[PDB]
Amino acid sequence: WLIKEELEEMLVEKLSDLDYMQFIRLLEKLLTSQCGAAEEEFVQRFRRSVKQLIEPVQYDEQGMAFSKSEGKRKTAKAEAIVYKHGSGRIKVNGIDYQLYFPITQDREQLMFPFHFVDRLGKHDVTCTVSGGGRSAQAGAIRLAMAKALCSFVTEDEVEWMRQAGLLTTDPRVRERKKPGQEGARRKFTWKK
Amino acid sequence: RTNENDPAKHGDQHEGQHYNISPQDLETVFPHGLPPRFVMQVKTFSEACLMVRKPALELLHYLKNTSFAYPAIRYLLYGEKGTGKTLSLCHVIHFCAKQDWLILHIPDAHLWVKNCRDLLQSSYNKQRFDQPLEASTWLKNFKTTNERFLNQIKVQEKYVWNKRESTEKGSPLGEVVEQGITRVRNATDAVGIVLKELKRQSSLGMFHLLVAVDGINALWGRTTLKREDKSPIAPEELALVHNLRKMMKNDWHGGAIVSALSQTGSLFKPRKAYLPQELLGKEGFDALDPFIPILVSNYNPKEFESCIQYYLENNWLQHEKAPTEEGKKELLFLSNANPSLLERHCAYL
Ligand SMILES: Nc1ncnc2c1ncn2[C@@H]1O[C@H](COP(=O)(O)OP(=O)(O)OP(=O)(O)O)[C@@H](O)[C@H]1O
Ligand SMILES: Nc1nc2c(ncn2[C@@H]2O[C@H](COP(=O)(O)OP(=O)(O)O)[C@@H](O)[C@H]2O)c(=O)[nH]1
Numbered sequence: 395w396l397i398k399e400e401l402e403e404m405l406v407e408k409l410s411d412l413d414y415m416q417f418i419r420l421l422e423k424l425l426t427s428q429c430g431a432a433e434e435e436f437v438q439r440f441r442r443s444v445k446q447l448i449e450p451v452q453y454d455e456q457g458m459a460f461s462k463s464e465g466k467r468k469t470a471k472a473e474a475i476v477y478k479h480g481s482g483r484i485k486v487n488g489i490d491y492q493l494y495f496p497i498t499q500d501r502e503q504l505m506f507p508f509h510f511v512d513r514l515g516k517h518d519v520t521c522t523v524s525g526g527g528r529s530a531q532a533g534a535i536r537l538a539m540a541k542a543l544c545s546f547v548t549e550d551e552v553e554w555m556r557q558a559g560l561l562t563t564d565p566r567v568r569e570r571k572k573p574g575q576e577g578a579r580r581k582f583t584w585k586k
Numbered sequence: 587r588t589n590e591n592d593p594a595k596h597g598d599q600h601e602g603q604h605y606n607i608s609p610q611d612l613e614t615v616f617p618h619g620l621p622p623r624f625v626m627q628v629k630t631f632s633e634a635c636l637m638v639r640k641p642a643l644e645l646l647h648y649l650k651n652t653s654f655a656y657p658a659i660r661y662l663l664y665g666e667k668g669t670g671k672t673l674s675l676c677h678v679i680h681f682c683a684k685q686d687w688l689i690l691h692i693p694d695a696h697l698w699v700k701n702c703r704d705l706l707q708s709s710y711n712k713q714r715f716d717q718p719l720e721a722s723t724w725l726k727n728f729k730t731t732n733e734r735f736l737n738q739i740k741v742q743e744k745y746v747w748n749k750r751e752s753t754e755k756g757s758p759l760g761e762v763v764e765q766g767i768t769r770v771r772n773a774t775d776a777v778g779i780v781l782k783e784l785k786r787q788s789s790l791g792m793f794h795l796l797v798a799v800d801g802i803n804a805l806w807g808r809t810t811l812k813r814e815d816k817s818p819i820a821p822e823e824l825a826l827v828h829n830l831r832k833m834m835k836n837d838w839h840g841g842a843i844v845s846a847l848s849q850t851g852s853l854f855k856p857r858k859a860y861l862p863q864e865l866l867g868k869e870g871f872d873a874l875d876p877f878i879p880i881l882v883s884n885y886n887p888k889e890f891e892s893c894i895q896y897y898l899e900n901n902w903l904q905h906e907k908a909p910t911e912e913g914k915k916e917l918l919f920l921s922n923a924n925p926s927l928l929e930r931h932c933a934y935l
């Protein structure tokens with residue numbers, strides 16, 4: 395149903411919230427009352443209309459297929475290239491993942507994308523990540539890997555990953571400090 | 587898991603399968619130098635099984651084909667952190683002990699270059715410093731390891747300790763060892779005497795020597811020991827490090843200088859430094875040159891499966907999901923087949 399402003403613009407008249415509500419209730423009753431074409435033609439005048447994008451698969455100079463993707467987390471940006479056939483090796487900035495991310499938490503984050511669609515050991519990965527700390531970098535690599543792996547998984551798998559949150563960019567970034575208060579939310583200790 | 591427990595017969599046929607160590611052998615050969623986590627694992631399981639791996643097997647091949655006439659060869663185990671270099675050295679040490687060599691075992695040269703509360707001045711050379719506590723500890727461990735050869739081996743010099751006390755030519759090396767252990771102040775001098783006597787007598791065919799040094803990179807690095815005037819101390823000033831460097835020269839024959847680099851516990855080295863030059867520096871690499879580097883890499887899939895099966899059979903992996911293939915894959919990923927990482931993970935898993 396159009397908004398009250400849309401109705402007001404149609405009628406070049408000023409309305410009220412309750413006027414709009416009454417009109418919408420009347421239109422709802424009209425719709426429910428088996429409105430025929432002779433009625434639906436009128437009804438539609440007040441009706442206003444209302445999935446992950448899979449990246450293309452490229453082929454290296456040696457002909458092996460891969461998918462490239464990018465992902466940002468906090469202040470860390472990662473670019474990931476996932477090969478169609480691989481032994482699970484992951485090279486981050488030229489360093490193997492267990493050496494780049496000595497933290498079990500970060501290695502778990504790296505595992506999560508592949509483990510979800512049950513493809514551990516199937517794809518090799520090359521990531522270049524810069525900015526942010528270890529956790530932010532791990533998250534960015536996770537996002538990039540999930541986005542790349544979308545191309546190599548089925549559509550149902552892609553939708554499942556989305557519903558699992560692998561494919562959504564974490565919008566949480568540090569809040570700017572405000573003048574006159576200690577932190578973003580911390581205020582100076584009040585002195586009664 | 588092998589029915590083969592003799593450390594000489596096993597080979598590639600036994601690669602990827604376990605090799606047991608009896609409690610008596612563990613107590614005698616290995617009173618020190620085994621990784622602390624492996625010591626804990628042995629304590630828990632009541633057993634000491636080391637997987638047979640290509641690095642250890644290759645080092646065993648070299649030591650079996652070693653010609654004692656030729657100058658003693660230097661073997662250097664290197665690899666990424668936690669690849670099992672120390673335990674491979676221990677496996678070769680056990681093999682040599684069973685072949686009845688004399689095992690001059692340095693559990694970790696890093697300990698000798700840092701965190702020393704008692705740093706006195708050598709009486710034999712006033713320009714060198716003593717590390718009596720560590721000297722005495724290593725002397726006790728060496729006595730335990732090589733008691734049987736200790737009495738049989740004799741000294742060939744006169745070794746003064748005090749202005750009135752000394753040891754006379756023909757005295758068993760056990761006399762020197764006892765002097766060093768009981769008299770802590772003389773531990774450094776006793777260690778030097780022991781190294782010198784072993785080095786000279788190995789060329790005389792009295793026995794076959796195996797100088798097994800873990801964390802060899804420490805000798806030619808920097809030390810965190812500061813003089814009384816807060817002055818930094820270089821390794822050579824430490825008599826122990828100086829004598830060990832002397833031992834680390836191929837000038838003699840009748841034995842093998844086996845050693846392992848170990849970034850863990852190193853000083854002024856980045857975490858990822860694992861190659862020989864990266865861990866040794868110009869001085870260390872030149873000193874060890876020529877040498878045979880041996881690469882110890884993470885578990886290959888067969889070895890990884892064998893280790894997982896070992897833990898499962900011991901019942902260590904308590905998590906109900908550990909036996910499943912999904913659990914195995916998750917462990918494999920989270921450890922990248924690295925021995926130390928896998929052990930630590932399975933500890934709490
Ligand atoms: N043959 C083996 N049998 C049993 N456990 C082994 C074996 N090799 C390695 N391990 C396991 O891995 C560890 C031993 O490897 P070690 O610590 O010597 O590796 P490293 O590569 O020398 O590492 P570091 O970087 O600490 O020097 C122990 O936790 C042990 O449980
Ligand atoms: N006190 C003492 N130490 C000895 C003796 N012989 C060998 N040592 C030990 O070995 C060192 C001497 O070894 P040597 O071959 O003379 O070489 P140097 O150390 O360069 O002089 C001493 O510093 C001791 O650690 C000896 O007769 N008396």
Ligand SMILES: [Mg+2]
Nearest residue numbers: 668670671672
């Ligand atoms: Mg080690």
